[PDB]
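@channel anyone free to eyeball this complex?
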Amino acid sequence: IRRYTDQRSLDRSFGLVGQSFCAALHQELREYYRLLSVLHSQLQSLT
Amino acid sequence: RIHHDVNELLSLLRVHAEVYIDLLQKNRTPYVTTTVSAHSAKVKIAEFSRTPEDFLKKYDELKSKNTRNLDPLVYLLSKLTEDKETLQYLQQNAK
Amino acid sequence: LVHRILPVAASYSAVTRFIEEKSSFEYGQVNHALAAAMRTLVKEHLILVSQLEQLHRQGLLSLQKLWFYIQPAMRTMDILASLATSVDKGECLGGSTLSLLHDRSFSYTGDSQAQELCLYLTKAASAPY
Amino acid sequence: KRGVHVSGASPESISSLLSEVAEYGTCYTRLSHFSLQPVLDSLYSKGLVFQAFTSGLRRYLQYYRACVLSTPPTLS
Amino acid sequence: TEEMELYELAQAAGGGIDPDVFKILVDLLKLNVAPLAVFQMLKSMC
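replying in thread with the prediction:
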């Protein structure tokens, strides 16, 4: 999703419909980054 | 509506007044689905035990087929109680 | 006594497959909504197993009485192996599978634990239809 | 475990005690063997009453195990 | 006949009908007919 997202958002011919779309993909990736430190800190029922 | 092919022709196709009244007796309603079958009618194939494994195995495969027409065959599994009153005409017809 | 526990564990692999086929989007509106709750059923069964899978480091488990632990616990899992057949009859969809799920929502009445899963799946599955 | 004759010196008398719990035992193995297999509304010969009957019969056999296994082996 | 549910089911246990009449009776299940009425109308003339 990251590789598709930056490789489509870098394309200036891809337009606003596509740039805002991949910006939404970026923000959903930023929201996705939350739980990866939780999975850390619960080791610092799960099983 | 379309009683020409499956009621008039089916009434005319019999080898034997109720010539036109048989379609009114078998006047089907196309808006229904009311089968009179039950799970007790599954033992109708047990009387024909010529090869009962390949007489009992067919019903699960016919149910596993994606057609919903296997339900009204409860009376048709028993069929006619007269001795070969439908089955024996094919041997005369093949000649 | 291992083979007493084998079929529930076997049943789980049919139901996580019912996720990863019936939640690919080609099957139909009613069908994806069933797998949307079968998502919940696999984590429910694995959360159940997470109440036991810790225990080997302290020895509470035993081979005879794991049957006693699993006998009320299959009802979260071992209903759904049949719900697979209920969609896999002809790749059924739409109202023509909701009729079968409708009559399956009243199906088992003597034990009466297989009714609720079909009922609760019909609630999720019929809503978008 | 019928050591007929010799067998490390225990007489006919103990065989007549052991072959009593053969009667209780084979009736538990066979009645539990009879009650063990479910019907699932699927055996074709067994209307649903028989399912509830066999369930209560397994409740009884579970109580029987719960009694046997509570028993200290430190008894004659 | 010429169908998987019209032809295979017509010769399972003991079998035997007229083939065209058997195909018409197999097609009558899709015509939403009451199972007893068509058989009674056939048996009242045959």
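from a first look: Chain B touches chain C through three residues (CB under 8 Å).
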